[PDB]
Write an enzyme that holds these catalytic residues in place. Structure first.
Site, PDB file in Angstrom:
ATOM      1  CG  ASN A 291      -0.148   0.116   2.535  1.00  0.00           C
ATOM      2  OD1 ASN A 291       0.450   1.153   2.830  1.00  0.00           O
ATOM      3  ND2 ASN A 291      -0.165  -0.953   3.325  1.00  0.00           N
TER       4      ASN A 291
ATOM      5  CG  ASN B 296      -2.092   3.910   3.400  1.00  0.00           C
ATOM      6  OD1 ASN B 296      -3.024   4.470   3.990  1.00  0.00           O
ATOM      7  ND2 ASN B 296      -2.262   3.232   2.272  1.00  0.00           N
TER       8      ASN B 296
ATOM      9  CG  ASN C 115       8.182   3.612   1.589  1.00  0.00           C
ATOM     10  OD1 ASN C 115       8.540   3.561   0.409  1.00  0.00           O
ATOM     11  ND2 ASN C 115       8.739   2.869   2.542  1.00  0.00           N
TER      12      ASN C 115
ATOM     13  CB  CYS D 216      -9.453  -5.513   0.009  1.00  0.00           C
ATOM     14  SG  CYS D 216     -11.069  -6.140  -0.398  1.00  0.00           S
TER      15      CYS D 216
ATOM     16  CG  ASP E 109     -13.538  -4.692  17.264  1.00  0.00           C
ATOM     17  OD1 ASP E 109     -13.172  -5.601  18.040  1.00  0.00           O
ATOM     18  OD2 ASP E 109     -13.894  -3.556  17.649  1.00  0.00           O
TER      19      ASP E 109
ATOM     20  CG  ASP F 293     -14.516  -0.003  19.833  1.00  0.00           C
ATOM     21  OD1 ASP F 293     -14.898  -1.189  19.951  1.00  0.00           O
ATOM     22  OD2 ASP F 293     -15.255   0.917  19.419  1.00  0.00           O
TER      23      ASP F 293
ATOM     24  CG  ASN G  81     -16.026  -3.522  20.990  1.00  0.00           C
ATOM     25  OD1 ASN G  81     -16.740  -2.536  21.196  1.00  0.00           O
ATOM     26  ND2 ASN G  81     -15.820  -4.016  19.774  1.00  0.00           N
TER      27      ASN G  81
ATOM     28  CG  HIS H 299     -10.920  -7.336   3.733  1.00  0.00           C
ATOM     29  ND1 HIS H 299     -10.318  -6.444   2.873  1.00  0.00           N
ATOM     30  CD2 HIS H 299      -9.993  -7.637   4.674  1.00  0.00           C
ATOM     31  CE1 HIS H 299      -9.078  -6.219   3.273  1.00  0.00           C
ATOM     32  NE2 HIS H 299      -8.856  -6.931   4.363  1.00  0.00           N
TER      33      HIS H 299
ATOM     34  CG  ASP I 165      -5.426  -7.372   5.076  1.00  0.00           C
ATOM     35  OD1 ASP I 165      -5.267  -6.600   4.105  1.00  0.00           O
ATOM     36  OD2 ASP I 165      -6.555  -7.671   5.518  1.00  0.00           O
TER      37      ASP I 165
ATOM     38  CG  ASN J 210     -14.319 -15.405  15.355  1.00  0.00           C
ATOM     39  OD1 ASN J 210     -13.124 -15.557  15.104  1.00  0.00           O
ATOM     40  ND2 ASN J 210     -15.185 -16.412  15.359  1.00  0.00           N
TER      41      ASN J 210
ATOM     42  CD  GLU K 156     -18.586 -19.176  17.596  1.00  0.00           C
ATOM     43  OE1 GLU K 156     -18.160 -19.139  16.421  1.00  0.00           O
ATOM     44  OE2 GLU K 156     -18.552 -18.197  18.370  1.00  0.00           O
TER      45      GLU K 156
HETATM   46 CA   LIG Z   1       2.748   1.662   2.762  1.00  0.00          CA
END
Ligand SMILES: [Ca+2]
Ligand SMILES: [Br-]
Ligand SMILES: [Br-]
Ligand SMILES: [Ca+2]
Ligand SMILES: [Cl-]
Ligand SMILES: [Cl-]
Lengths: 675, 681
Positions: free
Chosen positions: A224, A226, A229, A272, A301, A303, A305, A330, A353, A393, A448
C-alpha cells in the site's frame, strides 16, 4: 604466472532447472537457499598444492560475516555447513565446483568474488552476481511445503482466481499474478530495499531477510502507498478521477511496472483484492508459498471489543456511521512458513493483509497471524491477532438513531453474519475451496463460543413481524431492479405495520453513495397472514449514482405499535452485460492465434469511450490496449486481436472492457497451449 | 558602598564562535588577537560619574607594558589603540563591555584583572584567564589568509595526507593532526614555555610570541628531542627497540600526550613525516596557517657547495658514505605569514623543518625560509636558506671507489635528479598538489640556471668529457612487488656504438631505509655479455622472499644497483630503489555514520605467508570519530588465514572524517589503512 581465473561457467540452465527458478523471464542466475549449484571454473593453470581459493558472497550495502550477510569459504573436498565449495573434479585447468548455501541465508541479490592465494601473494576478482530466494522444496527451510501439487499452485502458478460478490452470490474474477514476467522479480526484490525498515537500518534489515515472517510483514506494509511509501493507493469513494477504477485492473504486472516507471509514486487506485493480488505476486516470486483469501461480511472492529455497530434512521436510511463497518467481502493473503517465535503448533498458513485498514505499531502493516492461532483465539500472539480475529468473529449490532431527537437504541445482535464463506482458489482448478473451518469452529458448537469468550477475555478482562427482502427476476445494469418485501404476522393479533424503505447505491465496503429510491407503506396483517410489497427501481433512477460495484443497499424499517422496529436488510448485485472472449483456432507455443472480443450494448443509448484491455502470462507480453469505437443502442462490437503463446500448459486470458456507461466489465478465458 | 564586581560572564560560546575557536575540546576562553570579544560584568551598584575601571591583562612570568606582555586600559566610550574596553550598554548594574586587543599582541595564556577607583580608594580583583592565538581571519594580522577555502584547510582541518614513497611511485599516508583534541592546544602552548629560548630569557621569549617567525622557528627546534629539549627522537637505523617503529604512528595526538605524560622525555621514535605531522599540529593549533610538504630525492647532505656525492664500488655495492645523502623523500612544513624582516615580496609560505639535520645558531632548528626567496636564490636571507635551497637544487655526483686501491673517480653528474614532485595535500580533497614550480624554475629554463649560479655565487682540474657511454642501462620492475612475493627485475642493456662490445656486469641488492641507510645485502651476481652494434640485451634479477625477508625493514625498500663496464670506457651505473607493497588492509563501516550514534567497523586482513603471523596489534584513531587511540590485540593468524576484527567508533563531529589504522605483527610491521567517513548530524 600466478594462479588466476580465466572464465566462469555458471551452468545457469542446469542450476535454474534444478532450483525450480527456470520459469522467470530473467536471464540472471536465480537460486534457492540451502541447495547446491554447480559451476565450472577454468583457471590459467593447475591448482597448486600450496595455493588456495576462497569464495566470498555478500548481500546488501553493509556485508558482514557476523550478520550472515557475508560469507567467506575455502575450496574443499568436503561440505561444511552454511556456505561451502567442494572441488568435485579437475580436468586440465577446469575445476568442477559444487557450491552450497545455508537454508537460513538472507534472500536477495548477492555478489560473488574469489580470493586467490598464490606465489606468496593474494589477488581478488569478482566472479559475478546471483539472486537467492526462499526454498519451499527444502525440508529444513522455514517455507517448506512438502506436497507437490500444493507447492505448484502456491509458488509456480501465475494465473489466479479471486472470489468476490456477497453472501447472496459469490462471484469471481481472474487475476494475473505474473511473477515470471519480465522485471517483476527484480521489482519485488527492490521493494525490500525501499521499506521503512531498510531506511531505518539497512544492515539489520538485509540480515533479517532470512526470515519469511519479516519479509512477509514488510511486504504487507509496502504493497500500500500509505505512510508515504508503497505501491498502491487505496480508494473506496466510487470516484477515481486521476487514476484507474480499481475494478479495471486484471493483474499485478501493470501495477508493479507502473510503480517503477513513475519513480515509485502511488499507483491509483486499488481496493482490497488489488492489494492482495499484488501481495500474492511478491510472495510467490520471492519463494513464499502463498494464496488469496476472501472473507465475506468482513468486519472492522476499531475498539477491540469483538463487536461492530451499524446504524439506520427510522426512515430506513443507512447512516454513514458504520455503513462500512462490515464489508460485503474483504480479501487478504496467507503465507506458508513455520513460526519459531510462536511454537511448533502455529506453523502453516499465516495471515498477511496489505490493505491499509488498521495501523500496527504506527504503520499500515498487518500480519503474519497464525491462522491456527486465530481459530483458537490466542490473540496475544504476534501479529495483529485482535484485528484479524474480529474480521471473522465479530458480533454485528444493529442500531436505530434519530438525529432529530438525538436518541439511539439497540435493535438486535447477530453473532454469526460476520465471517462467512471464507474462500480461496482450489489447487489445480478454479473451483472455490471453502476454508471457513480453518479460521473458526462451527457456529453453534461449544468450541466456537468457548474460543470467543477466550479471545474476548484477553482483550478486556418475540417480534410479531418477520421480514425478508427477495430479488425478483434477473438483476443487470440496464434492467429495472425488482424486489419484494415479504412480511408475516406471527402473533395472534391483527397488526398494523408501518414500513419505511430506501435504496442506496454503495461501494462493496459499504460506502454510501446516493439515495436512488425510497417509499413507505402501511399494511394491516391478520394473524399468520403473509403480504408482499413490491419494490421497483428503474434504470433511469439508479444509473446516475451506480458505481462499478453495481451494488445497491435495500433497507426496510418496519414497526408495529408497542413493538421494537424490525430491520430488513439486503445488498444486491446487478450483473454487467456479458463480455465474451473466444480463440478462433488451436493454441500452440510461438504460433500466433486470433482472438475475438464480443459485446452487445443493451442500452437505448450509445456507449462511448470504449477501451479494451487484455493480458495473460504466457499468452501475451504485457497489457494490450485497444480503443473501440462508439457502439450504438443494441449494437454489437466485434473486436479481433492476436496473442502469441510463449509457454505451454493451461493459461488464462483476461480482459477489461470499460466505456462511459459500463466501467470494468470483466471477461476471462481458459486456454490450453500445446507445445 | 564602594563600586565592586559581583560576577563576570565571558559569553564563551558566543565569543569563541565569532573568533573561530569553537572546535577546541577545551572549556576555556580561547580568542584570537586583534578581534573584539564581549563580556557582561555585573557590578554591585550603578557606575558613578567619578568612578573608574581599569582593565589589566598580562602574560608570561615578567609582564611589562614596555614589552607588550602587559596592558592597562580604562573602560571608555570609544575604542582606541591596542587594548581597549568600550562600554556598550548599562542595564541595572550590568555592564556590557567590548574588549579589543592589538593585532600585534603576543599569543599565549593571559590573566585579566580589574582595578576599581571608588570613593577615594582603589581596589583590585582578578577576573579570569583566557588564551590568545594568531588571527588568520584578521587582514592586519601577519598570518592573515584571505581565502576561505584555504584557511579552512590550512587552519581548521584536523585530518591530513602526507605524500611518501619514491619518484617511481608516490604513495600517501593519512595523518591525524587532531589540533582540537583534548589537551592538545594546552600542550602546544606549553612547548613555548619549555624552549631553550624561554629558559634563557623568559621576558624576551614571551614578548616575541607576537611574531610567527619566532614561534614557528622555536617550534622547529622543540618538535625534535635534540639538544636535550623537545618532543620526537629521530631514528633511521631500521631497529626501534625500546620505542615504536616510526611508520606505526597515525597522528600527532598520541605523540604529544605521550610527551607530556612521560615528563617531557623523548618520544621514540620518529622520522621526517612524523616530525612534520607533529609540527603541523602545533602550527595549526596556535593559529598559523600551515601544511605539509614532501620533497622527493631530497638532498640531506650537500654541505659542499650545492653538491652531494654518492659512492659505489666496482662490485656494484652502494657505499655507506653518501648512501643517505639523497633521501627518497623528505618531509617538512610551510607556515603562512608576512616577512617584515625580509620585505613585501617574501611574504607567504615559509619553510619550517623540525627534522634534526643541520644545526642553526647552535641548535637543531630550521626556518623560516621564504619559499619565494628559495625560488629566486636569495640565500643570504634568514633563515637557513643555504641548506633548504640545497635540498631542492643540489647536483648529484656519482662516484666509484675501490677500497683496495684507495682510488676514487667521478662517474657522472645529474643536475636535476634532486628536488622532484614536491607535493602537498590539495585544499578540500586528498588529491596530490604539486608545488615544485613554487620552489624552483623548470629544468632547462635559463631562469633556474641563473638562480643556481646566483645561489652558488653567494656560498663560497680537467675532467675531459668522453664520448657517449656506448652502453645504456636501465632497471625495470616485472610484475607487482609485495612483501611475501619474490622480487623480479630486468636489467636492460643496449650497445649504441657499432663495434660489438663486451660488458662486465656486477649487481647487488640491499635492503634500505627510505633515507638511504644501508641495512643488508640480500642479493648479488655478475655476468659478462657480448653485444653487437645497436643490439639490446636484458639480464634478469630475482630475489626470493626467503632472501630479503630477514633484512627488510618497515620501509619495504631495496636498493638495486648494477655497475656495467666496457674495456677502455667509464663504468655505467644503473640504480633503482624499489618498494614492496604490504598485504592489503581494509576498513569497513557497517552502517550509516551519524553524530553521537555508535557504529560498528570491520577490519579486514589476510595473511599471504606460508607461516603464521603473531604479536598482532591493531591501532585505530581519527579526530571526530574516536576519543584517542584504540588498541586491539589480534590473535595469532595462520597461513592464508583471515582476521575478523570488529570494533565501534562514536562520531562526535559532522562532516568528512578520516579513520586511520595501523596493523603490526612480527612479519609485517606498520601496515596502514585509511577510510574517509561522512558523518551526518
Ligand atoms: Ca505503505
Ligand atoms: Br443479489
Ligand atoms: Br618501485
Ligand atoms: Ca629539540
Ligand atoms: Cl526480473
Ligand atoms: Cl587544551
Amino acid at each position: 604466472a600466478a594462479l588466476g581465473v580465466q572464465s566462469i561457467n555458471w551452468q545457469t540452465a542446469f542450476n535454474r532447472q534444478a532450483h525450480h527458478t527456470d520459469k522467470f523471464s530473467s536471464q540472471e542466475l536465480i537460486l534457492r537457499r540451502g541447495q547446491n549449484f554447480q559451476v565450472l571454473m577454468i583457471m590459467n593453470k593447475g591448482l597448486g598444492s600450496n595455493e588456495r581459493l576462497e569464495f566470498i558472497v555478500s548481500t546488501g550495502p553493509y556485508p558482514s560475516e557476523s550478520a550472515m550477510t557475508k560469507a567467506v569459504f575455502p575450496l574443499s573436498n568436503g561440505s561444511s555447513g552454511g556456505w561451502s565449495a567442494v572441488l568435485q573434479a579437475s580436468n586440465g585447468n577446469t575445476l568442477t565446483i559444487s557450491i552450497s548455501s545455508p537454508a537460513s541465508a538472507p534472500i536477495g541479490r548477492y555478489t560473488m568474488a574469489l580470493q586467490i592465494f598464490s606465489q606468496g601473494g593474494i589477488s581478488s576478482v569478482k566472479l559475478g552476481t546471483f539472486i537467492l530466494l526462499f526454498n519451499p522444496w527444502l525440508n529444513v527451510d522455514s517455507v517448506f511445503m512438502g506436497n507437490h501439487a500444493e507447492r505448484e499452485e502456491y509458488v509456480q502458478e501465475d494465473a489466479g482466481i479471486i472470489f468476490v460478490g456477497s453472501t447472496n452470490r459469490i462471484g469471481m474474477i481472474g487475476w494475473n499474478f505474473g511473477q515470471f514476467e519480465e522485471d517483476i522479480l527484480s521489482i519485488c526484490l527492490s521493494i525490500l530495499d525501499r521499506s521503512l525498515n531498510f531506511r531505518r537500518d539497512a544492515a539489520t534489515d538485509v540480515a533479517s531477510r532470512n526470515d519469511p515472517k519479516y519479509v512477509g510483514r514488510v511486504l504487507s506494509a509496502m504493497i500500500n502507498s500509505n505512510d508515504d511509501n508503497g505501491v498502491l493507493a487505496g480508494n473506496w469513494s466510487g470516484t477515481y478521477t486521476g487514476g484507474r477504477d480499481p475494478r479495471s485492473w486484471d493483474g499485478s504486472v501493470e501495477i508493479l511496472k507502473n510503480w517503477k516507471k513513475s519513480g515509485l509514486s502511488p499507483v491509483r487506485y486499488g481496493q482490497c483484492w488489488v492489494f492482495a493480488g499484488t501481495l500474492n505476486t511478491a510472495l510467490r516470486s520471492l519463494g513464499i508459498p502463498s494464496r488469496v483469501i476472501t472473507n465475506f461480511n468482513s468486519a472492522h472492529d476499531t475498539d477491540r471489543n469483538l463487536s461492530v455497530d451499524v446504524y439506520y434512521d427510522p426512515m430506513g436510511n443507512p447512516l454513514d456511521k458504520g455503513s462500512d463497518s462490515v464489508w460485503n467481502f474483504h480479501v487478504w493473503n496467507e503465507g506458508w512458513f513455520v513460526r519459531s517465535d510462536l511454537g511448533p503448533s502455529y506453523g502453516g498458513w499465516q495471515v498477511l493483509d496489505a490493505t491499509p485498514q488498521e495501523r500496527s505499531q504506527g504503520v499500515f502493516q498487518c500480519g503474519p497471524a497464525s491462522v491456527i492461532g486465530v481459530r483458537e483465539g490466542d490473540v496475544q500472539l504476534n501479529f495483529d491477532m485482535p484485528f484479524i480475529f474480529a474480521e471473522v468473529n465479530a458480533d454485528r449490532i444493529t442500531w436505530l438513531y434519530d438525529n432529530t431527537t438525538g436518541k439511539q437504541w439497540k435493535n438486535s445482535v447477530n453473532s454469526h453474519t460476520i465471517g462467512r464463506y471464507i474462500s480461496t482458489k482450489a489447487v489445480g482448478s478454479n473451483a472455490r475451496m471453502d476454508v471457513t473451518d480453518k479460521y473458526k469452529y462451527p457456529e453453534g458448537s461449544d468450541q466456537e463460543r468457548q474460543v470467543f469468550q477466550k479471545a474476548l477475555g484477553k482483550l478486556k478482562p418475540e417480534p410479531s413481524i418477520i421480514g425478508k427482502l427477495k430479488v425478483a427476476g434477473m438483476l443487470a445494469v440496464g434492467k429495472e431492479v425488482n424486489l419484494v418485501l415479504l412480511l408475516k404476522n406471527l402473533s395472534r393479533d391483527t397488526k398494523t405495520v408501518t414500513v419505511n424503505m430506501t435504496a442506496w447505491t454503495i461501494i462493496y465496503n459499504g460506502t454510501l453513495v446516493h439515495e436512488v429510491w425510497k417509499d413507505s407503506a402501511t399494511m394491516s396483517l391478520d394473524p399468520e397472514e403473509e403480504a408482499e410489497h413490491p419494490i421497483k427501481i428503474s434504470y433511469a433512477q439508479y444509473e446516475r449514482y451506480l458505481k462499478s460495484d453495481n451494488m445497491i443497499r435495500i433497507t426496510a424499517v418496519c414497526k408495529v405499535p408497542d413493538e421494537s422496529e424490525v430491520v430488513v436488510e439486503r445488498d444486491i448485485i446487478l450483473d454487467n452485460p456479458t463480455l465474451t472472449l473466444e480463440v478462433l483456432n488451436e493454441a500452440r507455443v510461438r504460433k500466433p492465434v486470433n482472438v475475438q472480443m464480443l459485446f452487445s450494448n443493451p442500452l437505448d443509448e450509445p456507449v462511448r469511450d470504449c477501451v479494451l484491455m487484455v493480458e495473460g502470462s504466457g499468452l501475451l507480453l504485457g497489457n494490450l490496449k485497444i480503443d473501440v469505437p462508439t457502439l450504438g443502442p443494441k449494437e454489437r462490437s466485434r473486436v479481433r486481436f492476436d496473442i502469441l503463446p510463449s509457454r505451454s500448459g493451461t493459461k488464462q486470458l483476461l480482459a477489461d472492457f470499460s466505456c462511459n456507461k459500463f466501467p470494468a466489465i470483466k471477461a476471462m478465458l481458459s486456454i490450453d497451449v500445446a507445445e
